[PDB]
Symmetry: D2
Subunit: 455 residues, 4 copies
């Protein structure tokens, strides 16, 4: 088919709904393989849908066109036009290409929906109709916040709660299992496995509130700011109304940004929101490491806990259960850390009225959310729910450490108690064996004094 | 002073300069960790002293310390706080990851000094003891983390925040003052639709206001103190009311809302509160970077740049005024960005019951606070308060741009307006010149029609 | 179809060539959307091909099977089986899943090629045949280096040279155009546009040698190290031979790693090689920024150069040419910076005999190469080749700056010359206008003294 | 000293402490940039002095400076180098991005001191002048970059490299010593096939050897000096032989292969050489992090960890030996990682003819060199030289593992061997116990067949 724009005409694949501007970009921005993610495409479609409704309400668009555009939008949301967005993330910094991609796809489809044809003889026009009362400048940032807030609310937060609930049950289930504490990787005083796990729980609980604190700023929308933030060429009620419409159809508390200049010139809300995410990544990294070290073995590591074997193993090598879910989680955590740096440089690089590092910022942000959400779900289902204590190993280690000598101090002078600890350590004996051989006490009184369950 | 004093510890005797208040352990660390030049920050030292001062008071209250010994330790700490012993802490940041060595440094200095205060002498025949008295009811494991938060919270509340509010106020005043000044907008570095200088500056204001909220949201997690958790978090070897009492004392003497950490395992095993708080700081750094850049580009020139504004020339090519304050600010913003990565790595590396990357983490965190607070204070007083518009240059730019043709649309139609824009662009003429050459309107009409103030 | 392994049987989609282990992973590692990139799949196929050949040579594999496997491998290289590798990057840290994915696909296809069927009744066995004399431990790292070295040699380096050649021609073409230099964004002494561009050229030339210095370490292969690096269960000549085979079929100087322990336990070669890449990213970022700032305008920026308008523009807004290729390049540069951090954390996180952060490291590495290579190509073709000087603007600015007063010093006292500079600056006049009004000289002698083309 | 001295510059007169050698400009910077506590590194100060010393000699050689004045400046610099004026440089790192203020600091100190050396007095009636004499034939723009490379190259060659070679030698000796000690391998933290301790350590050796080469490859770019490029790189206002001559002088007095930069525009506009050199350093940091971690995990215990090796206990829970040197090393490795990001951001931010992020960049670079050099020196002398194997623990681990069953295959077949492994694993028995319980072999046969030394 032959589609055209100001620069003239250009042939586009007949079976496609996109136009000339999308085709040119497809030839000018052939960089790597990353394209806009589905969540962003949906957010962009939702933004066009709400814009169509409000424009209709203000009498700027005919009902016939308004409804057709919204219908084409719903088809995108339904997953009917995934193959219609071939543009790379590495395009113009404002995301203008992707805005045009949606305008053309929506206009062409909306034409067909009105008994028309796709292309040059279309009834609905991409710029004049679909992009009415908008600008690439304020539409893309809006799409970014819609996608981000929805991903955080719908995917990340629920998965975070679920994982916490599981670990919380585990904490309670193992509340009485006393184990040897470790600081600097060295044997220290005892604590219960339940207490150790409760530490992971509190970490996740704290992260949740931190992530929630970032939502309000992300809920602010640029729509209405127009080209530079002044709102020139828009109805005074447009910005507030469109924010309302979007809130209504997504069930999220979106609001119009109090300052459009800040909304257009920066990616601050995302730079901040992502800070909470890298915070979550550091916490998960620690939890994952504890799990895999505690399950290390089966014979030459710590082996205090056991996790489910998900992958098939060698017949001649029973016991080697690699903590794959832990390896997948730690890897994605490193990724979030890196994504943060990319976002920071982009967020700090805005100039004057517009920050033009947007596609890259949203690409990294959405990926982090995806990684963290799916990562917690997988870790939860394929590992966390199955954490079980190797009670024997736990006790063996507890009764093998010299750390329990403390209980004896209250019943025998610091030096005498420490005296048996020196012998046990030196001779390679256990505290009891050394205590009995040194004749400092009897088995009966020893056992009654060294009460690990009493801290 | 060449004269030494023989001090001793569990490992034996070692020589310490006679004129110094530290002991055996501090001397060993000093000789074992000769790494680089970074030592503990003055703020951290003072926080450690405040912690010991509070621990003493409460130990006295619980009758664990003799009133005389307690008051002595308390008085010695106050001298540290008054800046009388800044030279008594020579340990490098690069020491044991728990900060144990610096805890001992404070214990030894406080003991040797309290001894003298009790009519005693410093050294191995001191009246007050480092471990038995000064470190009573505490652990290196829970003391350092506590000092970290005390220092962090106070620096944020007393240094960072006040400076942020001040810069914000200044920019807000500038915003109101230049509200009527219309200038050319710039998107993608290209000329764009007009906006007032006041509106552009209001964007910086909103950025700073948003940053304040984010910083405020990170405070309650930092206010949580680990004191009471002892070695592994269980609180073994501590009076049940200690944690709460010591946290209350701290709150009282600092006037900061400190509270004991609900979960001590999370407090000892991680630096999560700081990883998250620093996330807000790197956010402020990204915003500051953008503001500083806008300021220097807008003041670039004097003849071959943008030159829309003028900034105070603070140092000794006639009109060549380098934006030095802007250069210091952008440089420190990059530092905060790198500091975030160092903090993230340390935060994600906790193992079991204790995170041993603490000195490095607090070192980077407190540096970022100093950099941001002082940077904003400097930028504000040496640049921000004196920003002035170059009204003539601004107006010259507006009248030379092709972006004002939009005002002609309603009078002569879009087609003729676009023709004028094209002519002016192709022939290197101003909009008025092109309009007149074509004869589409009179100069009087142009002057009455194109009013940039109605953008 | 029903495929099975040690854990039992599992149904796999009939029209697919993968087996049970791939199907289980597909259900256990449902994280995000990133899969192994084509270049890595090819490298893995090439590794299996070379392994099959050598195994045949050493008499470990029958000619019938050896040749069939190599044939199945060539089909993968031919792009016939892209849809056969559905595994996510976020899998087991050693890349075992992906190794099994290739073994199963290759075994199944190799069976069909031998008149057999795919599945349980296959003639060629994934583990026993395709993975003969190998381990997931030494195969994945080998695939990583093959993919990395080939991407650097075949894609990155050629694009780097091409871009340099173009800029080099430009430097030469503009060798005589004198322009105003800028330091701190302020007007400074003059230099030619050719000189400024030659700076970009030297930057690229230096980067090339830096990238070349990293190749030798990347050329070292782990194959032969087997499970822990000892080479247990392998023929002594295996490692060297397979390295040779791989060198032969790829035409790259691959060699067997001198130390297999270093090869297995770390990702050091990549951490180092990537360091050169982030170095290249910082250089490109600077070059891209200079281009877009120099082309800023058309009327209110610098506008010293003009670049090609690739995207269609508004009829009523001629002149607004957004530097899109520059925006795409700067965005991907920020990405490489972030990718480096992720790679660093992964490369630093190895434990004992094996680094298990591999899939994430190679994912980031290959993406950086792709971004940089395609980024330079696009920047070159759609921008660099079209850089043209706006000679008029350049001269206007040159004859408008006060910087030329220096030429007068040699003909008139420092103070007198500076005297006219003060007037020009203060009155807003040009150096000549001020010089003539101040009566310090005549137009003739002025023009003969102020020779900008003589530096 | 309360007494002041009146010094003056183009901006006027200002009071300087009478007891100090600096001047008016240094005093203004001191009062305008009160930011944080970081000042120029001693190494950088000395490099700046070396640069001025060389500039003087060559200026004398070209008859641009009077022999008397030249020798005086030269003698004053030597005092700085001898450490006699460390207190004369109070300027913060956070100053003008070109490092102009610190250049002036050295000019003023050198002038005031050279004056006295000529029988003159310091102050506004000095015999030697800061700008006219000490800064002769130079520019702040080309002097600071030069000082940066002098400092960088010397620190790498005299501090970093020697320490690296020393640690490598030590580890190599340990490798040869423990060559016969067979231990259990670990992949994914799980027990794996055996390897000798010497082989595991040889991996650390090869890592360090590879790092040395990478570091060496980055040196020639750092050896390139910008001196001669002047303000914008053209070399305007300089004797044609200056650049080469001054570079030769520097080379002679330092014995380092310094050479003038072939392209001065690349030298002034970027910090590329340092961005690249630091890339090799972050690589060494990742390797060191892995080695330090291996060491601390391998020494973990004494009863509930791995405990395969023992390290020197350097400071004053009997056998509880914290791996403090390991903790300092890992902490500083995270610092180098963050420093790389700060350096990258500054390196990527050059604008036109000059990069004004220099102080921050050199600050981070020299800190990384200090950290790595001192860290390796400390780790080597306080840990590495004393690493000893716990032969009994090692052997206990081997005999308790299921990984040795492989040796039975050739004698009793794979099926029976796997059965023994399964039995032992399910019932918590050693391989010998399971083998004997089944009656598949005699204890004598087990002892003769399973020889871990033949792994
Ligand atoms: O990226 C573009 O080319 C662009 C697109 C639009 C739009 O979609 O309408 C607008 C606008 O009219 O607001 C402005 C710009 C711009 O350059 O700033
Ligand atoms: O670094 C130390 O050596 C240390 C010191 C103390 C202390 O404060 O005395 C304690 C404690 O009893 O809480 C714990 C440790 C430890 O190693 O975990
Ligand atoms: O990841 C695995 O499950 C794995 C796979 C293989 C293999 O492909 O053969 C081997 C090997 O025999 O070398 C070892 C391991 C391991 O755990 O280290
Ligand atoms: O920072 C400065 O003020 C400065 C100082 C000098 C100098 O060394 O005197 C020069 C020079 O002539 O090379 C350039 C500059 C500049 O602003 O670009």
């Amino acid at each position: 088919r032959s589609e055209k724009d100001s620069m003239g005409a250009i042939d586009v694949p007949a079976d496609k709904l996109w136009g000339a501007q999308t085709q040119r970009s497809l030839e000018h921005f052939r960089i790597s393989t990353e394209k806009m993610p589905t969540s962003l495409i949906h957010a962009l479609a939702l933004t066009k849908r709400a814009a169509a409704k409000v424009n209709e309400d203000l009498g700027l668009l005919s009902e016939e066109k308004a409804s057709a555009i919204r219908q084409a939008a719903d088809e995108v949301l339904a997953g009917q036009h995934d193959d219609e967005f071939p543009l790379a993330i590495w395009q113009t910094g404002s995301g203008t290409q992707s805005n045009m991609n949606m305008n053309e796809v929506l206009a062409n489809r909306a034409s067909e929906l009105l008994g028309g044809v796709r292309g040059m003889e279309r009834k609905v026009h991409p710029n004049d109709d679909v992009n009415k009362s908008q600008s690439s400048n304020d539409v893309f940032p809006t799409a970014m916040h819609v996608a981000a807030l929805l991903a955080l609310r719908k995917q990340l937060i629920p998965q975070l709660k679920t994982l916490t609930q599981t670990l919380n049950e585990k904490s309670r289930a193992f509340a009485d299992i006393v184990k040897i504490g470790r600081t600097h990787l060295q044997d220290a005083t005892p604590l219960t496995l339940g207490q150790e796990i409760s530490g992971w729980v509190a970490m996740l609980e704290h992260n949740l509130k931190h992530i929630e604190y970032s939502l309000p700023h992300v809920a602010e929308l640029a729509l209405g700011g127009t080209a530079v933030g002044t709102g020139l060429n828009t109805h005074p009620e447009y910005a507030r109304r469109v924010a309302d419409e979007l809130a209504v159809i997504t069930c999220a508390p979106f609001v119009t940004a109090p300052n459009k200049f800040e909304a257009l010139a920066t990616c601050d809300a995302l730079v901040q929101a992502h800070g909470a995410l890298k915070g979550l990544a550091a916490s998960l990294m620690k939890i994952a490491n504890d799990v895999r070290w505690l399950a290390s073995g089966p014979r030459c590591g710590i082996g205090e806990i056991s996790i489910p074997e998900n992958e098939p193993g060698s017949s001649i090598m029973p016991g080697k259960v690699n903590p794959t879910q832990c390896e997948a989680l730690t890897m994605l955590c490193c990724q979030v850390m890196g994504n943060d740096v990319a976002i920071n440089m982009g967020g700090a690089s805005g100039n004057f009225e517009l920050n033009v590092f947007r596609p890259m910022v949203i690409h990294n942000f959405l990926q982090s959310v995806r990684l963290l959400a799916d990562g917690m779900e997988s870790f939860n289902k394929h590992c966390a729910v199955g954490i079980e204590p190797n009670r024997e190993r736990i006790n063996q280690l507890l009764n093998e450490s010299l750390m329990l000598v403390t209980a004896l101090n209250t019943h025998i002078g610091y030096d005498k108690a420490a005296e048996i600890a020196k012998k046990a350590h030196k001779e390679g004996l256990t505290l009891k064996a050394a205590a009995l051989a040194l004749g400092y006490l009897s088995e009966a009184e020893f056992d009654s004094w060294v009460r690990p369950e009493q801290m």
